[PDB]
Design a protein around this ligand. Structure first.
Ligand SMILES: CC(C)C[C@@H](C=O)NC(=O)[C@H](CC(C)C)NC(=O)[C@H](CC(C)C)NC(=O)OCc1ccccc1
Ligand SMILES: CC(C)C[C@@H](C=O)NC(=O)[C@H](CC(C)C)NC(=O)[C@H](CC(C)C)NC(=O)OCc1ccccc1
Lengths: 233, 232, 212, 200, 239, 196, 212, 202, 233
């Protein structure tokens, strides 16, 4: 076709095929789950290793003391976006001496990601994120897509076989608000486990957890540090 | 400002433009170079005298600096541009290091220039391959070959251009410490290698040599004829 | 502003139990000439902040415009986040320091007050970027005349009520009118409380004894 | 400050006091004024401390980059030229730097003087700083290309001690370095009080 | 291949890229806006893709200024970009000319910005249609609509989305010139509920906003009590 | 201040310069060379502000050698002098002027010996003899007195000794040793130093 | 228009076997006036480093903000906190970035090294930094330095056993030197802030001084 | 120089002298310092002639384009704000103080002051120029609220005449201009028309 | 007729995929991580006897404690190596410390995928780097080994093989590798795999070997040591 080579070409159905191709690029990555309670936000990601001797790729990255993102898609675009987030947060702290609200950071991300989708010879950022953070208005979970569109979510999962996690979260969304930190982390892990095939399990070497809360700066748990949560399956 | 990607990847991972530059150098004239014990030689096959062309203005052997020369094969104009850039670089190096350039330094600079040209925007790869020979301050002779891809290797004897494979096979079969025993034997080796490709022989040969602590010298046609007669 | 043209006199500030009070005379002086006598030198940044400015009045207008536009742009978003007085103080400090570095200073000396999260805020921003927070502030000639009275009262009684703060501000303004040569009788009082920002019209120092 | 370096048969010696003053206030008496660019090359500080430190550190960075690229250690002449060309772009802007580059290249011992004023001259005996003249006196009266190693050490120590004695803005400890074909070694750091007790 | 660039004219004299952008906006949900004597009222059929999204995500009603609203349809990223542009234009107008931007002027500026993307091959047309609503004593209640082509026209009632025809049919039978905002919110809810399709679309949430005399010339969401009364009235009307 | 001198004869140019490099009050070097070899038959003598002299001379040296390699024939003394003047004049009005005083000596196969004078303002001039620095004030009179166009190189060396002896007798600065060189059809020859 | 102003302030740093002390007074001045009495000049950077800035207050604030931002950048790009030596090197680079518009700030760093032992780094406005065992900077540097050299350095005293410094003795010395300085130097007074850096954490104390 | 504007119910009354000096030499003695920015907006120029003329031309261009864009009469506040922006941005290079007065339907007659530095304040009556310092007391004492057009014209003429009498940079003729809904009624008082106040002799 | 920044329906960048394809045409390089150090081996791939083996620089030194092995387009690797060296020295100058292996890998990876056609730079890059890298060195966290591809994705690897013989060399590494391997065992295993996978016979002139250990700096084996190891194995 002649309508699926540039991002400045409209299809006769009002679709920009490159944006859906970037969406597919996001959907072909590893699965992540994010969920929030009335006092906490949890990011759970499933890391994939190229070979048995290759360290599992990291997926939860710091942004500030109150923001963290899980990535699903191109790693270079992920790092570029993370650097932009960090610079924006540092600028906000330097100028105003206050944490940057998560919603404003997501808005800036959307504005930045829009520009490529409207200019010649530029590609959308082939990465989808799950921002988790705590601001003055409580915990937040946001989802970003290469289409420069974002949504405020109670819970979400993006990546390969993420529909099973989405169905689980929808079924069990009622209890999320009134759940201790351990219960919420276990719910996120259960959502992530549903994505795995039958012959695979959640080990300490392929699970990452990111907690942010009122009295808990954003922390990344990996390796043996995720054992306490895994116990109780 | 032209900002188009002239050189791009293709399935199977080939930079087709660089392959076409290789083809261009293949279609070019023939050049030979041999590293001796105390002498470095360069040979070039003249396409045709034409009986009315000044040999002074068609030389394919040039001196980048006092201790470095190089002969090329491919498109002449790109060779001229590369020669000028290399000369400017040699002068700058002598200015800011207070020591004469080494052969390795200048070949690496030329290779870097070619790489930049095969990865930049709106510009095609260079279509020449250069044999760079000279003497370092330590007195050790050197000989390097550079390709449009930006790859440079150190050779003891190589050929580029038309009939590169045939001359290279001849050199491999007929290169030994015995053949590099004396300077005259080395020049005879270069002439013999060139004669494996050039039809007329003798008349259609351009030969230059550099000795240790001596300026680059182009052998006059009489000397080339004398060596050709000696070979036969 | 390399050369100031129309300038204001000191701006006072004292924090009480449940807000802050700022006073500034209505006067624009062109070098020993009360050219403008009905200009307000107190700004209401938002529902929980205020800003009184000394020095050049044109630069005060510029800061007023920029800060108002910032507050508006924030409100349009409607995300439930308010620029805290500390945020405005930090932004002002950064702007003044940047202008100083560029060698094009904003000739002003502002006093920022606010009430957020059940805590009073009182900041000082200088032309050169000097920033600090203290219970009492006094710019210009107030630092020599009015500040001692406020500091003595606060040291004797760290926590003051609203009426005591207002009386202290009135006394300090009276002293300034007595002793400062670029001062005016008419002045404004601004207060920030949990109820918001209120600015009192043109008051007077009629309690001016002149026993000679 | 007073720093000196002279070339003799067995290498090049480098000496320097360790006093830094801010006007008339002695900021420190333990300032290292000999920088180790590489095990076979070293420089000296004199003038503005910040300028000399920054530009010598940048010179060390550039020398390491050169070594990595060319697989051969940089020469003293190359390092001196690099520093001179790098500080020349800031001529007239107030840089107060006087340095000596000492080492052992493929051409034998080297010794170069570099100044913020643009000078770059090689030589056998050099001394830079406030006490440069006082050190020059003793160094010239006692220098000889055929000095024994201990005699060279004594000459450098005595020159720096005399410069400290006659100069107010110089003092502290006399650091002494010796360059050889196999690198440099720091031989001693003797305090001026002990040297005064030994000589007087 | 006459429809691969906004800089190419088809033989009939059409710019097919703008047509495809119009089709792209035509594939989104419906948004209606009715002008009344007091002011203007907006309504958006905010479809909910999944129950995981919070109430308020993907908001399609923006405040580009104190006194100007914005209801969008189509690609939401483009809508947000245009909203930021409108905010910038309003701020510039206030800074330079020293007073609030008239709605007609802002519509003109944003339309001209949109039109600049329908001329070159280096940029694609915006895939979003939006409406602007403002009220002031000097100027009165105003409502405008801007399409991807850049055409800006004033409207007593507008509808952008897939159900534009139905919404126009329902709006056309209202004496909006004499009714007030309070009586217009209920009608907007009725229209949104009527145009909504349940067989195709799963569920939706009603988003309302207005600006008029009751609000002192400020654009803000309709309070929860008023919105709930409007939804109850719409459900009763549908029966 | 430094010292330069040049005598142009029938078939040669004789040049000499001092070998002192003083920082403030101390002669930090005693065998400095102030002559730059531009080509096989061209010399440049530079005296002036520290840093400017070396930078300018090395830049001109690089450009001249680059010309020689690019074209295969060396630049003529007149061409080199004009090139130097053009560069200096261009840099005169910029933000990075060079405060350097020059003296260009060279030999040409056709035209013959040439001696060129150039000041920090880039005013080129050709003279049979010339000098630079505060020592010129004392040597120009001697050169005018004892100079003839048909002067042999030996007699020219004697005249240079006369000038340097006058410098030793009358000038205040210490200029003990002078480097001496001569350019002829055979190239540049380095003659014995004049020492005191 | 003068872009600089001296706001006073004294800083002190002591390095011990297993601790580091950073002390500063809490007075901010301008000319002959006093801005505040609760403006500490000790800023905490990490869990094992403290930096004390004195001089021009605006430049001090800007530098502190830059250091905080750079610490966070290094943590993000290297996934590990910076050491005291890294902070010193970065500060030296930053200060020299503005050689032609220098930071009118006197800096001092105190914290543990990689081995767990104390370390103190003293800086000049241009960037020169040296690893010292004790150092005082600011208005009363000349008044504090000699006493430290005599007592902890045991200078100019013969037949004195060089017992290693103890934390109690270090705190006593800091308090005494600051009390003595407050008696002579006008710019130093109000109150004293002491930061003790150890493996357990950073402890803070405050002892009052003269208000004159 | 002496420039003045007064505000009455329905419009404004402007007035300025007609002297342009280059030291002690009167280059122009009939200069018109009241410049029509728009149909019903006027500016009184004090300070540097070149700066004031350039600013006036720039504001005229901007305001005309603005009026064409919005099919409605301009606002006096808009002209005042444009002058304020231009003067504040280029305060270091400009030497010009301006008074802006005119009529618009929204707020009626208004007077604005834009002195050096780019301030903007609305006043009932504004004065400016070198000679304004000599009539501050007069305007303060003889100003009343709710004056009539004729009374304002007489007041402006009297105060301007005093300023011309006492200031060496002011002189010539008094150029008055009244702006209201009807239009602009321009006037020029010269010779005996200028108010006269007797001088003492002992 | 598609631009460099173009997405396939499978959510991949065509140029990056083709660059991955070009890697498979390069020489084989192996690296192994051990508690005693990191070893690196490469295949010289000599074409004619007249070529000096010493001129084939397939293992280079970034700093005194880091080395890089590469396969693919060497001319492309030169720029990345120069960037790595400059970054390491810049870090030393600014912070007076040795850059971590992960930091150098990240800095070099950021360069990849920074190519475009419109509005990039006067001399921006037009295509991805068609060369794979194998970083190895000792940091505060001990010996480390990292693998970088044209896509800019870097992962810690215990033992990785890159090049034409990657498929099969990796299998042999899986068969032979254990956590407690010693440096000599690692070197011998790498040599065995290289001998098995090379088309030509293995000798001391047609292979390169380098090691980095906590005590010793980057060391490149000479003919004597290589011959000793070859004889032993
Ligand atoms: C290498 C230097 C220490 C040599 C030393 C000479 O004795 N320099 C000096 O004493 C210079 C003299 C100046 C006129 C160049 N004086 C100085 O005061 C210099 C620079 C200031 C002017 C900002 N040193 C200075 O103040 O900093 C000393 C210092 C050094 C390290 C850490 C903390 C403080
Ligand atoms: C706005 C004007 C129409 C009013 C007029 C009345 O005083 N202005 C002036 O007279 C001002 C003097 C200024 C110091 C107030 N003079 C001017 O603007 C003159 C007028 C010439 C064209 C004859 N030109 C000018 O640029 O000023 C001359 C000058 C230049 C430098 C210093 C002092 C004076």
């Amino acid at each position: 076709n002649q309508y699926d080579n540039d991002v400045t070409v409209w299809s006769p159905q009002g679709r920009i095929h490159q944006i859906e191709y970037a969406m597919e690029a996001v959907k072909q990555g590893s699965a992540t789950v994010g969920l929030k309670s009335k006092t906490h936000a949890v990011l759970v990601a499933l890391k994939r290793a190229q070979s048995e001797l290759a360290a599992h790729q990291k997926k939860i990255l710091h942004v500030d003391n109150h923001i963290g993102i899980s990535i699903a898609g191109l790693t270079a675009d992920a790092r570029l976006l993370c650097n932009f987030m960090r610079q924006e947060c540092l600028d906000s702290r330097f100028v105003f001496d206050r944490p940057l609200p998560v919603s404003r950071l997501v808005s800036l991300i959307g504005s930045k990601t829009q520009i490529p989708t409207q200019r010649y010879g530029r590609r959308p950022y082939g990465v989808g994120l799950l921002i988790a953070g705590y601001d003055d208005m409580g915990p937040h979970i946001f989802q970003t897509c290469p289409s420069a569109n974002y949504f405020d979510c109670r819970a979400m999962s993006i990546g390969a076989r993420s529909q099973s996690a989405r169905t689980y979260l929808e079924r069990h969304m009622s209890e999320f608000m009134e759940c201790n930190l351990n219960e919420l982390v276990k719910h996120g892990l259960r959502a992530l486990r549903e994505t795995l095939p039958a012959e695979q399990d959640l080990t300490t070497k392929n699970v990452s957890i990111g907690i942010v809360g009122k009295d808990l700066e954003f922390t990344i748990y990996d390796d043996d540090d995720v054992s306490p949560f895994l116990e109780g399956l | 400002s032209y900002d188009r990607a002239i050189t791009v990847f293709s399935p199977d991972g080939h930079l087709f433009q660089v392959e076409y530059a290789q083809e261009a150098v293949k279609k070019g004239s023939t050049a030979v170079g041999v590293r001796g014990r105390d002498i470095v030689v360069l040979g070039v096959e003249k396409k045709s005298v034409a009986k009315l062309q000044d040999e002074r203005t068609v030389r394919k052997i040039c001196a980048l600096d006092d201790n470095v020369c190089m002969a090329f094969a491919g498109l002449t104009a790109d060779a001229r541009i590369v020669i000028n850039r290399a000369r400017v670089e040699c002068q700058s190096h002598r200015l800011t290091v207070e020591d004469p350039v080494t052969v390795e330094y200048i070949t690496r600079y030329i290779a870097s220039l070619k790489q930049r040209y095969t990865q930049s925007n709106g510009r095609r790869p260079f279509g020449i391959s250069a044999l760079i020979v000279g003497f370092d301050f330590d007195g050790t002779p050197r000989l390097y070959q550079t390709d449009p891809s930006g790859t440079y290797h150190a050779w003891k004897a190589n050929a580029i251009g038309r009939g590169a494979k045939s001359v290279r096979e001849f050199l491999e079969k007929n290169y030994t410490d015995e053949a590099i025993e004396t300077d005259d034997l080395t020049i005879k080796l270069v002439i013999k290698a060139l004669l494996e490709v050039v039809q007329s022989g003798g008349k259609n040969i351009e030969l230059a040599v550099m000795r240790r602590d001596q300026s680059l010298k182009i052998l006059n046609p009489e000397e080339i004829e004398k060596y050709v007669a000696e070979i036969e | 502003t390399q050369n100031p043209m129309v300038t204001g006199t000191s701006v006072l500030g004292v924090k009480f139990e449940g807000g802050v009070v700022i006073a500034a005379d209505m006067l624009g002086s062109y070098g020993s000439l009360a050219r403008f006598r009905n200009i307000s030198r107190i700004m209401r940044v938002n529902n929980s902040t205020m800003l009184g400015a000394s020095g050049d009045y044109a630069d005060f207008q510029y800061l007023k415009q920029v800060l108002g536009q910032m507050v508006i742009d924030e409100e349009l978003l409607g995300d439930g986040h308010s620029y805290s007085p500390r945020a405005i103080h930090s932004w002002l400090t950064r702007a003044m320091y940047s202008r100083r570095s560029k060698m094009n200073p904003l000739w002003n000396t502002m006093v920022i007050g606010g009430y957020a999260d059940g805590e009073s805020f009182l900041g000082y921003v200088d032309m050169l970027g000097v920033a600090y927070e203290a219970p009492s502030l006094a710019t210009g000639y107030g630092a020599y005349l009015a500040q001692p009275l406020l500091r003595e009262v606060l040291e004797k009684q760290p926590v003051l009520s609203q009426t005591e703060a207002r009386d202290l501000v009135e006394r300090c303004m009276r002293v300034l009118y007595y002793r400062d040569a670029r001062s005016y009788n008419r002045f404004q009082i601004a207060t920030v409380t949990e109820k918001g920002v209120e600015i009192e019209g043109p008051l007077s120092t009629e309690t001016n004894w002149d026993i000679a | 400050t007073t720093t000196l370096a002279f070339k003799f048969r067995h290498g090049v010696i480098v000496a320097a006091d360790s006093r830094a003053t801010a006007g008339a206030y002695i900021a420190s008496q333990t300032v290292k004024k000999v920088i180790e660019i590489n095990p076979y090359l070293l420089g000296t500080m004199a003038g503005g401390a910040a300028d000399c430190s920054f530009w010598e550190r940048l010179l060390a960075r550039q020398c390491r980059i050169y070594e990595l690229r060319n697989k051969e250690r940089i020469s003293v002449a190359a390092a001196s030229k690099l520093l001179a060309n790098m500080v020349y772009q800031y001529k007239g802007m107030g840089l107060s730097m006087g340095t000596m580059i000492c080492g052992w290249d493929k051409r034998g011992p080297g010794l170069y003087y570099v100044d913020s004023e643009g000078n770059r001259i090689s030589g056998a005996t050099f001394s830079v700083g406030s006490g440069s003249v006082y050190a020059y006196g003793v160094m010239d009266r006692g220098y000889s290309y055929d000095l024994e190693v201990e005699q060279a050490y004594d000459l450098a120590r005595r020159a720096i001690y005399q410069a400290t004695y006659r100069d107010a803005y110089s003092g502290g400890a006399v650091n002494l370095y010796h360059v050889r074909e196999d690198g440099w070694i720091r031989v001693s750091s003797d305090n001026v009080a002990d040297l005064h007790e030994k000589y007087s | 291949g006459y429809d691969l660039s906004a800089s190419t004219f088809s033989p009939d004299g059409r710019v097919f890229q703008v047509e495809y952008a119009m089709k792209a906006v035509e594939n989104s949900s419906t948004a209606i806006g009715i002008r009344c004597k007091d002011g203007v009222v907006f309504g958006v059929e905010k479809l909910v893709l999944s129950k995981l999204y919070e109430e308020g995500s993907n908001k399609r009603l923006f405040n580009v200024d104190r006194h100007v609203g914005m209801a969008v349809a189509g690609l939401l990223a483009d809508a947000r970009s245009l909203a930021d542009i409108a905010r910038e234009e309003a701020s510039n107008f206030r800074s330079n000319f020293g007073y609030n931007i008239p709605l007609k002027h802002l519509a003109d500026r944003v339309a001209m910005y949109v039109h600049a993307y329908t001329l070159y091959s280096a940029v694609r047309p915006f895939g979003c249609s939006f409406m602007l609503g403002s009220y002031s004593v000097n100027d009165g209640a105003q409502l405008y609509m801007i399409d991807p082509s850049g055409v800006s026209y004033g409207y007593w009632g507008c509808a952008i989305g897939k159900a534009r025809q139905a919404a126009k049919t329902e709006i056309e039978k209202l004496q909006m010139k004499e009714m007030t905002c309070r009586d217009i919110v209920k009608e907007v809810a009725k229209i949104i509920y009527i145009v909504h399709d349940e067989v195709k679309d799963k569920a939706f949430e009603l988003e309302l906003s207005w600006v008029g005399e009751l609000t002192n010339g400020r654009h803000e969401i309709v309070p929860k009590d008023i919105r709930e009364e409007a939804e109850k009235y719409a459900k009763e009307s549908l029966k | 201040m430094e010292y330069l001198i040049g005598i142009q004869g029938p078939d040669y140019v004789l040049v000499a310069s001092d070998r002192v490099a003083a920082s403030n009050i101390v002669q930090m070097k005693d065998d400095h060379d102030k002559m730059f070899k531009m080509s096989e038959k061209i010399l440049l003598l530079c005296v002036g502000e520290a840093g400017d002299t070396v930078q300018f001379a090395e830049y001109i040296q690089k450009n001249v050698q680059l010309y020689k390699m690019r074209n295969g024939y060396e630049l003529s003394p007149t061409a080199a002098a004009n090139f130097t003047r053009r560069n200096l004049a261009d840099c005169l009005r910029s933000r990075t002027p060079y405060h350097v005083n020059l003296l260009l000596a060279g030999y040409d196969e056709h035209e013959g010996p040439a001696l060129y004078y150039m000041d920090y303002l880039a005013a080129l001039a050709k003279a049979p003899f010339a000098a630079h620095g505060y020592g010129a004030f004392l040597t120009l009179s001697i050169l005018d007195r004892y100079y003839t166009p048909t002067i042999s190189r030996e007699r020219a060396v004697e005249l240079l000794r006369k000038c340097l002896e006058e410098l030793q007798k009358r000038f205040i600065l210490n200029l003990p040793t002078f480097s001496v060189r001569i350019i002829d059809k055979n190239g540049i020859h380095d003659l014995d130093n004049i020492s005191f | 228009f003068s872009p600089y102003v001296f706001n006073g302030g004294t800083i002190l740093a002591i390095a011990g076997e297993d601790f580091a002390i950073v002390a500063s007074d809490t007075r901010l001045s301008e000319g002959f006036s006093i801005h505040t009495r609760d403006s500490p000049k000790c800023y905490k950077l990490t869990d094992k480093t403290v930096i004390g800035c004195s001089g021009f207050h605006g430049d001090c604030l800007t530098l502190t903000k830059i250091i905080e931002a750079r610490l966070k950048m290094y943590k993000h790009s290297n996934n590990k906190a910076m050491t005291t030596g890294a902070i010193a090197a970065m500060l030296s680079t930053i200060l020299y970035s503005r050689r032609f518009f220098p930071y009118y700030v006197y800096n001092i760093i105190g914290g543990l090294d990689e081995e767990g032992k104390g370390a103190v780094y003293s800086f000049d406005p241009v960037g020169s930094y040296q690893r010292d065992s004790f150092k005082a900077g600011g208005s009363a540097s000349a008044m504090l330095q000699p006493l430290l050299d005599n007592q902890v350095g045991f200078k100019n005293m013969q037949n004195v056993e060089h017992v290693p410094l103890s934390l109690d003795r270090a705190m006593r010395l800091v308090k005494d030197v600051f009390i003595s300085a407050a008696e002579r130097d006008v710019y130093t007074g109000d109150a004293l802030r002491i930061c003790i850096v150890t493996k357990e954490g950073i402890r803070e104390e405050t002892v009052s001084l003269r208000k004159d | 120089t002496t420039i003045m504007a007064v505000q009455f119910d329905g419009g404004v009354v402007l007035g300025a002298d007609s002297r342009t000096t280059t030291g002690s030499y009167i280059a122009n003695r009939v200069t018109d310092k009241l410049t029509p920015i728009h149909d019903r907006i006027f500016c009184c120029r004090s300070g540097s002639a070149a700066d004031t003329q350039a600013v006036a031309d720039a504001v005229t261009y901007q305001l005309g384009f603005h009026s064409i864009e919005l099919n409605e009469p301009p606002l006096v506040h808009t002209a005042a704000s444009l002058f304020k922006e231009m003067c504040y941005r280029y305060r270091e290079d400009l030497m010009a103080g301006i008074i802006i007065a005119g009529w618009d339907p929204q707020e009626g007659g208004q007077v604005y002051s834009v002195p050096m530095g780019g301030m903007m304040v609305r006043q009932s009556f504004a004065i400016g120029g070198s000679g304004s310092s000599y009539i501050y007391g007069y305007v303060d004492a003889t100003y009343r609220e709710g004056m009539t057009k004729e009374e304002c014209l007489q007041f402006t003429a009297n105060a301007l005449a005093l300023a011309m009498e006492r200031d060496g940079s002011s002189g010539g003729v008094i150029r008055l201009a009244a702006i209201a809904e009807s239009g602009v009624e321009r006037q020029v008082l010269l010779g005996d028309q200028i108010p006269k106040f007797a001088v003492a002799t002992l | 007729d598609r631009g460099v920044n173009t997405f396939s329906p499978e959510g991949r960048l065509f140029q990056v995929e083709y660059a991955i394809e070009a890697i498979k045409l390069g020489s084989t390089a192996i690296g192994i991580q051990t508690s005693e150090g990191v070893c690196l081996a490469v295949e010289k791939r000599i074409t004619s006897p007249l070529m000096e083996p010493s001129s084939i620089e397939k293992i280079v030194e970034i700093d005194a404690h880091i080395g890089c092995a590469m396969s693919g387009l060497i001319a492309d690797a030169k720029t990345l190596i120069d960037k790595a060296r400059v970054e390491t020295q810049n870090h030393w100058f600014t912070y007076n410390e040795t850059m971590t292996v992960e930091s150098v890998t990240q800095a070099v990876s950021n360069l990849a995928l920074q190519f475009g056609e419109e509005d990039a730079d006067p001399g921006a890059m037009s295509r991805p780097f068609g060369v794979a890298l194998l970083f190895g060195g000792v940091d505060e966290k001990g010996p480390q080994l990292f693998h970088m591809d044209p896509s800019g994705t870097f992962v810690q690897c215990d033992a990785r093989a890159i090049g034409s013989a990657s498929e099969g060399a990796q299998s042999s590494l899986q068969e032979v590798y254990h956590k407690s391997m010693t440096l000599k065992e690692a070197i011998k295993s790498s040599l065995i795999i290289l001998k098995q996978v090379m088309e030509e016979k293995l000798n001391a002139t047609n292979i390169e070997l380098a090691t980095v250990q906590p005590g010793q700096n980057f060391h490149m084996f000479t003919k004597e040591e290589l011959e000793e190891v070859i004889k032993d194995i």
